[PDB]
Amino acid sequence: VENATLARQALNRIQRSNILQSFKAKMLATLFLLNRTRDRDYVLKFLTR
Amino acid sequence: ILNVEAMHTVLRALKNTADAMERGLIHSFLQTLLRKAPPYFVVQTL
Amino acid sequence: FEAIFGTFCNRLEWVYFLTSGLAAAAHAIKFHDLNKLTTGKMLFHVQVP
Amino acid sequence: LSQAGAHSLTPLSMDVIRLGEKTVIMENLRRVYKNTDTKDPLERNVDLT
16 A cells, blocks of 8 residues: 555566565564554554554 | 446446546646646745 | 352353454355355456546 | 636535644545556655766
8 A cells, every 4th residue: 555556557677676675674664563662643553554 | 138238338437437537637737736836945945 | 978069050151243343344144055056256347447 | 717606606624724824725635546547646756866
C-alpha cells in the first residue's frame, strides 16, 4: 500500500528494488511492537495503518 | 440471456466511461494547477 | 470413619461459532449436499477504474 | 465571466482549517485514485545532483 501497485499491474525493475529496500527497512523497523516501545499514539497509528 | 448480458455490459461500460471521464477531468485540472504553481521558496522570496 | 464430601463435576463453559467475533470475520452459509461437489469456483465481475 | 453559477447551491461536508483569518479547505485524493492505472500527479519525482 506504500507503493501504488496491485496484482494486475506489471512491475519494473527499480520499482521492485524499492519494494525490496522497503522490505529490508520495515522488517527491522517494525518487527516487534510491545517489545520495543509503549507509546500510545504509535500503537494507535499502527492499528490505523 | 445474451441480450441481458449485452445490455448489462454496455451499461456498465458507459457508466465506467462517464466516471473515468470525470476522473480524467480532475486529473487534467490538477495537472494544469501543478504546472502553473511555483514552489514555496519562489513566492516566499518574492 | 472417614468423610466423603460433595463430589464436584466440571460444569463445562459452552461456546458457539456465531457468538464470538470471528463470525463477524466471515459470511457463513449452510449447504446441504457439500460432499457432492467436485469443485466450485466463484467468479468476480470486477470493473477497474 | 462571473455571470455563471447563480441561484445554485448545495451543502456538502469537507474539512476546513483556520490559519490567521485564512480558512482553507483540506482534502486528499486517495479516494479518487485507489484502484486506478495512472499515478497521482501529486506523487512527483524530484531530482537532486
